[PDB]
Paper text:
Dihydroxy acid dehydratase (DHAD) is the third enzyme in the plant branched-chain amino acid biosynthetic pathway and the target for commercial herbicide development. We have previously reported the discovery of fungal natural product aspterric acid (AA) as a submicromolar inhibitor of DHAD through self-resistance gene directed genome mining. Here, we reveal the mechanism of AA inhibition on DHAD and the self-resistance mechanism of AstD, which is encoded by the self-resistance gene astD. Our structural and kinetic analysis of the mutant AthDHADs has validated the hypothesis that larger hydrophobic amino acids surrounding the active-site entrance enhance resistance to AA.
Furthermore, we also generated mutants of V178, which was shown to interact with the isopropylcyclopentane portion of AA in the AthDHAD–AA complex structure. The AA resistance of all V178 mutants were increased, where the IC50 values were 0.97, 0.43, 6.00, and 2.34 μM for V178L, V178I, V178F, and V178W mutants, respectively. The observed increases in IC50 suggest that the larger hydrophobic side chains of these mutants effectively narrowed the entrance to the active site, thereby impeding the entry of AA into the catalytic region. To probe the acquired resistance mechanism of AthDHAD mutants, we determined the crystal of AthDHAD–I177F (2.45 Å), AthDHAD–V178W (1.77 Å), AthDHAD–V496W (1.59 Å), and AthDHAD–V497F (1.87 Å). In the crystal structures of I177F, V178W, V496W, and V497F, the occupancy of [2Fe–2S] cluster is 0.64, 0.72, 0.63, and 0.77, respectively. The overall structures of the AthDHAD mutants I177F, V178W, V496W, and V497F displayed high similarity with the wild-type AthDHAD, with the RMSD of 0.123 Å (888 core Cα atoms), 0.275 Å (994 core Cα atoms), 0.142 Å (1,034 core Cα atoms), and 0.283 Å (994 core Cα atoms), respectively. As a result, this mutant also affects the accession of AA to the active site. Both V178 and I177 are close to the active site. Alignment of the AthDHAD–AA complex structure to V178W reveals that the side chain of W178 has 2 conformations and not only makes the channel entrance narrower but also occupies the position of isopropylcyclopentane of AA.
Author numbering:
A (entry chain A), B (entry chain A): 3 to 13, 16 to 574
The structure:
């Protein structure tokens, strides 16, 4: 599709295609005077200008180290004969905001980050970009900006956090999230609870397991938009700083080849990213982010594309949440390149795709050490953890425009039960606390948590933990138009579309309606007749929006459905 | 008005009204684990958390020093017994982008900055904010965020740049903008031109005269949202770092009083800001930014309010662009507090308004040194530069919803001439180059440069300089639905509403239509009959938008008219 967003270069083989707009014409003397004031010499004006976009801030572990990484990227850009100009956008902490109304601001931060980087690159006429995200929503935001601008770019992942260790126990952020419920159930004492909180996050880096950040870092490496090993080198590893110092050398080569994001992000490399998500058991959130990335380069990517790749790619990796190990253990067995080399050898990946190294994926992977002999993290193709991928698309009566579930295969094939409907997370949690037994056998519906109804499509962790804490994990099902962070050991479906705020069938369910989930048929159905459902829709009125001003009201005005990746600029 | 945007504090006299949402409940153990990982002790969890939002980036003189200022703010916050968490948003350089399509991204950056700070403060549950903007659009963006959140906040202006000096000549960014035209006219040699560019911007700080940055810094100080002297201390002055180190002490007192932005930004303090703009000859851009600030706190502010204050307040200050001196000279004669003390003594200002010092404006100004004896920058009330303010609101046939002009009083009372219409800056400049004499006596209309048509309401400097370079300054008039950066010595009107993209009368003007500007009647009229104008409107079709994706398409979808301050969140 013909994306029209950002300025075109003035009208070659020059390396400063964009910055020449302001450094060369005498009519841009004001621009050149500012550039002299910031320290550029006349000779520096002849060089390419690289925008170095970090997402540093001090109040989150995933982002507090990124200013140090940005300094290393700048040094490397200068060492490559170019001008490096650092800038920095916002981000938010999913781990801090989880459980609170601040989570309404998280998903849209991806789109704000994309707008932020697009704005600076366009106004300042930078020739290329190196982005340094370190947290969940940051990663896709930086790629989406690169796709809109279509200027040479590289994403340097800030790296994963290391697990915490204390007194021969290991902890991560998920240990800290689970601490409260374990204390309420009497599984741990208050003092043991406090010990978890002091040792779960030991330093810088993104949350430690195969959750959204590590899913997206790995997928973006598989897509060719990060250098080999970026996704698997830990945040505090000296090799991460070395990658930062090399990004300028690689970007220089991309400027010489004019190898741009829309030359790298293609239908085949989007498929390669999706293959990595299925093989590694990555997060359902990658559906939203990979759709948004595809749209940013003018391509199409639908829920059905995800179902087809899921069916074609087995789940192979024993990594948390589903499994035992964490990202740092992948690092020790050869890293993301070793994993992708195996998937390429199995024929699951397209090796001809160009990448930010200036060569193809197959050329990158030809030389990397293979998975360490004897490793038990990546299963052989003949003994997979699941025959197909975890990610499942469900439609049917109640999700006619789609929905997304993580299906391990241990939940069974079907669930049927009467609906128990809540207009938000708070009322569901109050009910399961006051009367957990009323939840046994039900299909729990938490609605009004979609892109517009939330607002902001918040991710919710407490409902699954509350259900497991009450002993109900395999005894009820959970449905939302929002997102769920965890599994329950039972059926858990998010992203239901249309959302309740938009008058989708989820907004018409009544307590007691019999809902049946059929994984084989890929349907979430209701025993209520289509005619009675249409009767309810004729009487339905959309509730008032929860905001009338500020960034979230703009989001309500702009956001597309979850099946459309919640893009905001169409 | 009942603004609903951001989270409410959990339900006092505590100083951590918001951060207690995440530091106190056992159910927020994940939040506390992240906070330990970023370095907070158990005792630190009891403290207020201050979001310190800077707009640092390396590629603009107005912003390159702001990371150093942010470190000083953090030290002062810690010295005041609180936790300081730095974060940083984007900005763009009007001086670099001027003359290019990158300028389409400038005005909307104000609204992106507001969204950015709102997002972080909300997701992270910070109790208060100290913002450090240093450039044009940054300032109102930070205040708009503070107004939405209504949490205690202080804006620390990054400070003005100093004029450049070389070989007994003085230069500023405007010298550099004018260099090309002077070279084309043969007024200066190419070597003299190059010398201007090397000496116009000597260090850090916002553009040096009473242009938008210094207008807004002064207005925001007059509004009570910056500490005394913030607007007049130069960026490179040691006293600016001292102000940074004191902001935490003042913010602590605001948390103790719960003195919030909506307690400080009121109809009376908005009027005080407007008084400072009129007395100092500040930029027409302040109309857009002060309207947006008023809306952010749920207040009303219209073009007619600006006309009433302009009529009530004389233009008193001999400052560039209109005058001789620059901001650093105001600093030497007692600074912005001395100016405001004089305006308060004259009865032009409401002294009872509360400010970020925890006291009223009158209490702040009681002790400040008055304007230095013998100073000739601020005229006495009995000998003003202009009896009323420079800012004039014009309506009439062609701007029925309003427009904004800077009127010195030396242009005369009326202009009439045939219309010469251009669909953008490029075609106007091509025409004045190829045939300057065809412009003599005309009313030049540059349309399609509005919020949606530009897109982005770009500010245009070249048309006025081209008109003066051709010797036509007092021989034609200039009208736009966009914005003009400079004066021409003749009639120059911007912000014409409705804009051409919206089918306003400006979009129906044809070459040769007789247009009359009447300053006394405050009207821009056409000799074309209302019936023929309505005939043209019935045949008019809106042109296609110039973008279909990215941040500027979102802006097109969200932005209100210039008469409504180009707000995006309503
Ligand atoms: S909060 Fe950053 S990846 Fe979890
Ligand atoms: S570009 Fe920053 S105030 Fe002029
Ligand atoms: Mg996510
Ligand atoms: Mg402005």
């Amino acid at each position: 599709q013909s994306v029209t967003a950002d300025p075109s270069p003035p009208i070659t083989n020059k390396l400063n295609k964009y910055s020449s707009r302001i450094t060369e014409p005498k009519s841009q003397g004001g621009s050149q005077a500012i550039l002299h004031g910031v320290g550029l010499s006349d000779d520096d004006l002849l060089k390419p200008q690289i925008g170095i976009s970090s997402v540093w801030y001090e109040g989150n572990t995933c982002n507090m180290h990124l200013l140090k990484l940005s300094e290393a990227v700048k040094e490397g850009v200068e060492n490559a004969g170019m001008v490096g100009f650092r800038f920095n956008t916002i981000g938010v902490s999913d781990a801090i905001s989880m459980g609170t109304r601040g989570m309404c601001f998280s998903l849209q931060s991806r789109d704000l980050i994309a707008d932020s980087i697009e704005t600076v690159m366009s106004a300042q006429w930078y020739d290329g970009n190196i982005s340094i995200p370190g947290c969940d929503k940051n990663m896709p935001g930086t790629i989406m900006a690169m796709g809109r601008l279509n200027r040479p770019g590289i994403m340097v992942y800030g790296g994963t956090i290391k697990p915490g260790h204390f007194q021969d126990k290991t902890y991560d952020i998920w240990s800290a999230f689970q601490s409260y419920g374990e204390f309420v159930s009497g599984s741990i004492s208050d003092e043991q609870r406090k010990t978890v909180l002091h040792h779960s996050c030991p330093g810088a880096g993104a949350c430690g397991g195969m959750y959204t950040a590590n899913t997206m870092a790995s997928a973006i490496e598989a897509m060719g938009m990060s250098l080999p090993y970026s996704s698997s080198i830990p945040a505090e590893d000296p090799l991460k700083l070395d990658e930062c110092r090399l990004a300028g050398k690689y970007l220089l080569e991309l400027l010489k080849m004019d190898l741009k994001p829309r030359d790298i992000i293609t239908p085949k490399s989007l498929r390669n990213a999706m293959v990595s998500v299925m093989a590694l058991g990555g997060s359902t959130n990658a559906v939203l982010h990979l759709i948004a990335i595809a749209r940013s380069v003018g391509l199409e990517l639908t829920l059905d594309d995800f179902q087809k790749v899921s069916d074609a790619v087995p789940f192979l990796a024993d990594l948390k949440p589903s499994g035992k190990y964490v990202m740092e253990d992948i690092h020790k067995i050869g890293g993301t390149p070793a994993v992708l080399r195996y998937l390429l050898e199995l024929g699951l990946m397209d090796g001809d795709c160009m990448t930010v190294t200036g060569q193809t994926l197959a050329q990158n992977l030809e030389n990397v050490p293979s998975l360490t002999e004897g490793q038990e993290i990546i299963r052989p193709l003949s003994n997979p953890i699941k025959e197909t991928g975890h990610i499942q698309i469900l439609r049917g009566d109640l999700a006619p425009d789609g929905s997304v579930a993580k299906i391990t295969g241990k939940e069974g094939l079907y669930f049927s039960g009467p609906a128990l409907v809540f207009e938000g997370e708070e009322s569901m949690l109050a009910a399961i606390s006051a009367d957990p037994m009323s939840f046994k056998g039900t299909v729990v519906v938490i609605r009004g948590e979609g892109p517009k109804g939330g607002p902001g499509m918040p991710e919710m962790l407490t409902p699954t933990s509350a259900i497991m804490g009450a002993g109900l994990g395999k005894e009820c099902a959970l449905l939302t138009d929002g997102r769920f962070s965890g599994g329950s050991h039972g059926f858990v479906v998010g992203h239901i579309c249309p959302e309740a705020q938009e008058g989708g069938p989820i907004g018409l369910i009544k307590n007691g309606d019999i809902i049946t989930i059929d994984i084989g048929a890929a349907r979430i159905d209701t025993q209520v007749s289509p005619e009675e459902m249409n009767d309810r829709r004729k009487k339905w009125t959309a509730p008032a929006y929860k905001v009338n001003r500020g960034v979230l009201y703009k989001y309500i005005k702009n956001v597309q459905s979850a099946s459309d990746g919640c893009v905001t600029d169409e």
